[PDB]
From Swiss-Prot, chain A:
PANTHER family: 60S RIBOSOMAL PROTEIN L27. It holds the Pfam family KOW. InterPro entries: KOW, Ribosomal_eL27, Ribosomal_eL27_CS, Ribosomal_eL27_KOW, Ribosomal_eL27_sf, Translation_prot_SH3-like_sf. One of its GO terms (cellular component) is rough endoplasmic reticulum. Residues 6-35 form the KOW domain. GO terms for molecular function: structural constituent of ribosome. Component of the large ribosomal subunit. Required for proper rRNA processing and maturation of 28S and 5.8S rRNAs. It comes from Oryctolagus cuniculus (Rabbit). The modification N6-acetyllysine is found at K26, K92. The keyword Acetylation applies. Keywords: Acetylation, Cytoplasm, Endoplasmic reticulum, Ribonucleoprotein, Ribosomal protein. This is Large ribosomal subunit protein eL27. Component of the large ribosomal subunit. Interacts with RRP1B. Interacts with DHX33. Its main location: cytoplasm.
From Swiss-Prot, chain B:
There is a cross-link at K55 (Glycyl lysine isopeptide (Lys-Gly) (interchain with G-Cter in SUMO2)). It comes from Oryctolagus cuniculus. This is Large ribosomal subunit protein eL34. Component of the large ribosomal subunit. The ribosome is a large ribonucleoprotein complex responsible for the synthesis of proteins in the cell. Keywords: Acetylation, Cytoplasm, Endoplasmic reticulum, Isopeptide bond, Phosphoprotein, Ribonucleoprotein, Ribosomal protein, Ubl conjugation. GO terms for cellular component: cytosol; endoplasmic reticulum; ribonucleoprotein complex; ribosome. The keyword Metal-binding does not apply. It is found in: Cytoplasm, Cytosol; Cytoplasm; Endoplasmic reticulum. Belongs to the eukaryotic ribosomal protein eL34 family. GO terms for molecular function: structural constituent of ribosome. GO terms for biological process: translation.
From Swiss-Prot, chain C:
Component of the large ribosomal subunit. Interacts with CRY1. Residues 206-231 are annotated as: Disordered. This is Large ribosomal subunit protein uL2. InterPro entries: NA-bd_OB-fold, Rib_uL2_dom2, Ribosomal_uL2, Ribosomal_uL2_arc_euk, Ribosomal_uL2_C, Ribosomal_uL2_CS, Ribosomal_uL2_dom3, Ribosomal_uL2_RNA-bd_dom. The keyword Ion transport does not apply. Its main location: cytoplasm. There is a cross-link at K41, K148, K233 (Glycyl lysine isopeptide (Lys-Gly) (interchain with G-Cter in SUMO2)). Keywords: Cytoplasm, Hydroxylation, Isopeptide bond, Ribonucleoprotein, Ribosomal protein, RNA-binding, rRNA-binding, Ubl conjugation. Belongs to the universal ribosomal protein uL2 family. Hydroxylated on His-215 by RIOX1. The modification is impaired by hypoxia. Component of the large ribosomal subunit. The ribosome is a large ribonucleoprotein complex responsible for the synthesis of proteins in the cell.
From Swiss-Prot, chain E:
The modification Phosphoserine is found at S1, S7. It is found in: Cytoplasm. GO terms for biological process: antimicrobial humoral immune response mediated by antimicrobial peptide; cytoplasmic translation; defense response to Gram-negative bacterium; killing of cells of another organism. Its main location: cytoplasm. One of its GO terms (molecular function) is RNA binding. There is a cross-link at K17 (Glycyl lysine isopeptide (Lys-Gly) (interchain with G-Cter in SUMO2)). PROSITE patterns: RIBOSOMAL_L30E_1 (PS00709), RIBOSOMAL_L30E_2 (PS00993). One of its GO terms (cellular component) is postsynaptic density. This is Large ribosomal subunit protein eL30. Coiled coil: none annotated. Pfam families: Ribosomal_L7Ae. It comes from Oryctolagus cuniculus. Belongs to the eukaryotic ribosomal protein eL30 family. The modification N6-acetyllysine is found at K17.
Length: 135, 62, 248, 91, 98
RNA sequence: GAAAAUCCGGGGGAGAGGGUGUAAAUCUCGCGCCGGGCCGUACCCAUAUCCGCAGCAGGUCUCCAAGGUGAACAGCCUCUGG
RNA sequence: CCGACUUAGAACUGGUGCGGACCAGGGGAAUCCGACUGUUUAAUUAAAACAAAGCAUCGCGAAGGCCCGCGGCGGGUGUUG
RNA sequence: GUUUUUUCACUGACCCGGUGAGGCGGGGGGGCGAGCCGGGCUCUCGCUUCUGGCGCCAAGCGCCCGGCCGGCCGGGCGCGAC
């Protein structure tokens, strides 16, 4: 369909997180009065879960796959859309544009995306999405 | 841009933040040809999976 | 009793080549398993000018097939090479310009350059500016590819020895006249001390066997014996036929 | 205005070097300083850097061409000939 | 059907709604307006796959024009050169069924 | 139309770090602390400290560079200085 | 409201003096040679001599040509073709 | 047979070229073509070519082997890489 959905995986193209994988939670097809460019809020993965190996410790593996997430508004042309998509809720109640007023609220959207990328990393579903891009 | 134009042996003194911009390949490569080497690093990798899928055709019919 | 200019040239010190700003030894890549049995991909980084060479060179940065490092080779730039062009080298590599492969695995009437005359010597033949070597024929038994050279003489080669496909760049530079002596001064300062050519008839008889005389003449036949000794061997060396050439 | 009748870029040499050696060299001297039509961008920017090495001042793409012209006659006839024997091999 | 594309390209320029250029077409692909994308053959091969991957997602036909961006600009009735072209509405043109 | 010493950034992710603290490992942040040995250093630098047998009209590499006249670092005249 | 420097024009005027010192091309018509620029016998020859671009042959496809070296699995041209 | 001896290839001194002396030669396991009514063979390829990314320090699958109270806290060895 119209390939900028609230479920699409998305390569972050510029900024601090250049090359990080992101999933759109909100597409804003027209320009809002604040952001006149056509934009889409993403919640991506800053620090990736590492390549894990068999005959490691139980407590050791629990240190490796610690997703550190981010949450950010980007443009449609500061992002690269992919054919991949992730089935993830990421509720509007937390992951929201109301969260860019308080740095205390933003520790929860960074924490909300963190969990739902962590506790669905151990599934093996969307295993492309958690392996870092090679450049 | 974002890196000080200075004598090379001065950079021992300069802090880490003076010497690199906060990005992947930051202070080593230009942001324009970073975002060409993010797309290519993906679109070439996508093209490899089309070869992985077209290899899953031509042997199953003989 | 004074040594002639050519004998002095052989020694060194002054008549040596000016190899300071020379941008390196234009040679091929070394043969390994990724040359002999298949191919390997390496990108052209930048076409570059070598002071003391008419043709330009090419920094072609290959990946190392064994080590984590990335190797870089100074090729003779084929005419039509560009930066970021993929140049493939080995047996199974294709037959297009820059794309180097051994001569046994290309058809006859094929233009090559930077060709190995012996297998391994890593580029020796037909590798000055704009020179083309053709692949005349093949001999599947005994590995004898006859190769026409820029001179015109055909050489039997070992058919398992590699040449870059296409002609060498900087082609047709000898069409432009050097109009002023200063341009020639600058040409030979890049190469070696040999330019301001003093003709023997101007030289005194103690320096050069064409010297002396109240007229500025030779007096002896300028065409000389191949056996002729070190210092006497001057003029038209072992000249089969001489004078003005007509037709072919 | 029109300022020289039939000396071009080789008017800079004035009286020196001959008539035929300022009637022959003009052909080379024009071509080597010509802003040629680039194939990678289209921008009239293929400027001769050095000898046989042509540079685009837009893409920043260096090309190993002919000395005085971007493509010599006996380099492009080779390209088609190499490409003709290419198809004649593989089939 | 080589010389018929020069005729059809005019019929988008005169009647239809078009977007010449990359950045503006790369958006009007993403708006779901692009019913075709036309590329020149001397466009960057990174930008070639960039377009061909958006037109995979948009499910839009990527026509490869058999001339350079200088020839494409002349065909598209302009005096400037253009690699990337997208058509919003062809107008009175069978460019999609051709 | 120089090399090399030297310096820095990056990409990788082997590791290390502490278990909710009296936090840890760690820091190219701001102060603090101690140290920097060895050799040359005067003066002439040219119509008198150099080389030409000499206070020899020769020769000998550079830096700074006022006002007027003027195209002008031309020539002539003047200021500081000598 | 603040101008910074010239070009042009006409007046008037001196005993026709005035680029007032300084700075600072004698000119034409032919001949021979060397195209030119460059260079040259430091201390008697700066030349028409040398060099020169251009032109032309000659050698050589590398165990090779050309040359060096008492010598060598030696050395220069050669980081060459 | 013995020697004089022209003519082909032999390698083993001897010379040359490359290399950071990195896969050479036979043979087998494994894929494309050929012939017999699951059968045993004659020869061919042996993994990268649409784009100025990425690639090192092995994943995987086997098997022995250290404690304490047949269940709990790791190292080593093979194919992978004939």
């Amino acid at each position: 369909g119209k390939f900028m959905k609230p479920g699409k995986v998305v390569l972050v193209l510029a900024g601090r997180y250049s090359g990080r994988k992101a999933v759109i939670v909100k597409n804003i097809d027209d320009g809002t009065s604040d952001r006149p460019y056509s934009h889409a809020l993403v919640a991506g993965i800053d620090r990736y879960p590492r390549k894990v190996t068999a005959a490691m410790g139980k407590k050791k593996i629990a240190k490796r796959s610690k997703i550190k997430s981010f949450v950010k508004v980007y443009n449609y042309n500061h992002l690269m859309p992919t054919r991949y998509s992730v089935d993830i809720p990421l509720d509007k109640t937390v992951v929201n544009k109301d969260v860019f007023r308080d740095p205390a609220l933003k520790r929860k959207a960074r924490r909300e995306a963190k969990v739902k990328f962590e506790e669905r990393y151990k599934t093996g579903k969307n295993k492309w999405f958690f392996q870092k891009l090679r450049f | 841009r974002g890196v000080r134009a200075v004598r090379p042996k001065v950079l021992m003194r300069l802090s880490k933040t003076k010497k690199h911009v906060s990005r992947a390949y930051g202070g080593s490569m230009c942001a324009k040809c970073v975002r060409d080497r993010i797309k290519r690093a993906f679109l070439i990798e996508e093209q490899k999976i089309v070869v992985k899928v077209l290899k899953a055709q031509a042997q199953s019919q003989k | 009793g004074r040594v002639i200019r050519g004998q002095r040239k052989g020694a060194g010190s002054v008549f040596r080549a000016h190899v300071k700003h020379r941008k390196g030894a234009a040679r091929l890549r070394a043969v390994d398993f990724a040359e002999r049995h298949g191919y390997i991909k390496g990108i052209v980084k930048d076409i570059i000018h070598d002071p003391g060479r008419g043709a330009p060179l090419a920094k072609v940065v290959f990946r190392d097939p064994y080590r984590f490092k990335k190797r870089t080779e100074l090729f003779i730039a084929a005419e039509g090479i560009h930066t970021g062009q993929f140049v493939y080298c080995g047996k199974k590599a294709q037959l297009n310009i820059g794309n180097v492969l051994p001569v046994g695995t290309m058809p006859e009437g094929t233009i090559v350059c930077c060709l190995e005359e012996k297998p391994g010597d890593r580029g020796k033949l037909a590798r000055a500016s704009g020179n083309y070597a053709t692949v005349i024929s093949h001999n599947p038994e005994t590995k004898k590819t006859r190769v026409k050279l820029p001179s015109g003489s055909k050489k039997v080669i070992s058919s398992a020895n590699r040449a870059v496909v296409g002609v060498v760049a900087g082609g047709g530079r000898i069409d432009k006249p050097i109009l002023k002596a200063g341009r020639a001064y600058h040409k030979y300062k890049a190469k070696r001390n040999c330019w301001p050519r003093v003709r023997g008839v101007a030289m005194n008889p103690v320096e050069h066997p064409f010297g002396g005389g109240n007229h500025q003449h030779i007096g002896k036949p300028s065409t000389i014996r191949r056996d002729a000794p070190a210092g006497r061997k001057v003029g038209l060396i072992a000249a089969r036929r001489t004078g003005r050439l007509r037709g072919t | 205005a029109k300022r020289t009748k039939k000396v071009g870029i080789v008017g800079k040499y004035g009286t020196r070097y001959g008539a035929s050696l300022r009637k022959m060299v003009k052909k080379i001297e024009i071509s080597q300083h010509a802003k040629y039509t680039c194939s990678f961008c289209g921008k009239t920017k293929m400027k001769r850097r050095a000898v046989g090495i042509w540079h685009c001042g837009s893409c920043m793409k260096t090309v190993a061409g002919g000395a005085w012209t971007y493509n010599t006659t006996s380099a492009v006839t080779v390209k088609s000939a190499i490409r003709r024997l290419k198809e004649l091999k593989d089939q | 059907s080589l010389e018929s594309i020069n005729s059809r390209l005019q019929l988008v320029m005169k009647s239809g709604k078009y977007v010449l250029g990359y950045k503006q077409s790369l958006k009007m692909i993403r708006q779901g307006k692009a019913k075709l994308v036309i590329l020149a053959n001397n466009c960057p091969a990174l930008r070639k796959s960039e377009i061909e991957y958006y037109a995979m997602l948009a499910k839009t036909g990527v026509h490869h024009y058999s001339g350079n961006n200088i020839e494409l600009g002349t065909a598209c009735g302009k005096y400037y050169r253009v690699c990337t072209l997208s058509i919003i509405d062809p107008g009175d043109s069978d460019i999609i069924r051709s």
